[PDB]
Symmetry: D2
Subunit: 111 residues, 4 copies
């Protein structure tokens, strides 16, 4: 139900081994929910299941700064954060992020 895809606009490639953390807003604060690293294809699958991914407000933090640091390029952002309300009925969500050192774009494909 939730997929994250990250691309690198400097090299024209998937952004591989980018750490991604997902959080859910608690009744009070952000509670950790899921995490992983992007694959060779810049994709992270399997973050959650249909049963666990209930309506709520979620945050996806993509660790863009470590990615750029590993390539030797000075970035602007600490990370890219995408915050969205889910399921306002169940859908598949692809959160896609296109990364440059001083700029990022994020889009949601909801199907």
């Amino acid at each position: 139900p939730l997929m994250v895809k990250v691309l690198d606009a400097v090299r024209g490639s998937p952004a591989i081994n980018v750490a991604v953390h997902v959080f859910r807003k608690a009744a009070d604060t952000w509670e950790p929910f899921a995490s992983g690293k992007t694959s060779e294809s810049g994709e992270l699958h399997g973050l959650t299941t249909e049963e666990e991914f209930v309506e709520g407000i979620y945050k996806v933090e993509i660790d863009t700064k470590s990615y750029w640091k590993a390539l030797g390029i000075s970035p602007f952002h600490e990370h890219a954060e995408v915050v969205f309300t889910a399921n306002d009925g169940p859908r598949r969500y692809t959160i896609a992020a296109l990364l440059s050192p001083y700029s990022y774009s994020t889009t949601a494909v909801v199907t």
Copy 2:
């Protein structure tokens, strides 16, 4: 200024007017402290948020209230807000323009950093 925010609407091809913007700075105890806030003008710009003296080195968060913007135009957007988080003035004072381009299910943000 040292810090300007510019917001554009990619559906209308126009500046995004009356968009709330909240700026926070990370404290010594790792909390986010309110730093400044404002709303974008008829030109999509928000000037005047801070001064060179108050805008010290730190990690800053700029949160643009894109959801209220879309909802007032009748759109239910995907994102709650657009948030940009960055280290400022680490190599000395700079001037920063934070630009965001908004669509209902996408946004882009760019920084222009000058001397």
Copy 3:
């Protein structure tokens, strides 16, 4: 060897049934090379084969204006045109385009 993917930033969906034309620069002008329409997944595959897709300068024209017109939204651009030199050795190219009425982004994933 060449894939085109198109997304709709207004609806957060694949951009379906978008006409795509591909051209190669001739020794003189743009010569038509391939075309098709994006699928339900916003993808267009099968434009060309490894043997036909030689080094050269190619143009991909995506008919964004008809897409927006079909949805009842007034667009700015006539089309989105991506022009690139290929194979400067053989690679798989994904040309991705994210569409809004007054803005588009295009990226190349070369693998």
Copy 4:
């Protein structure tokens, strides 16, 4: 203004200076006629391309020479150029800002259209 072009570099977070820009207008016989050209200033802006009288209704093409820009910085970029093609002044005179954000394998272009 009636026509301005702005170009930013997403690798450096800075305006894209000395970028060649060529503007064409589609003729009655369906050819592209040269209309105006210029290069971006130290602020990434190109002003002065045309006047209200000469900028009639038509289909215009703005071609930004992004490849020469990247190559002068030592980068072999994906795109030959960024080209924006649009109908202008169909509902009366407007002012157009064509903004492009450049990376080596990506670019975005946006239009701000005002009265």
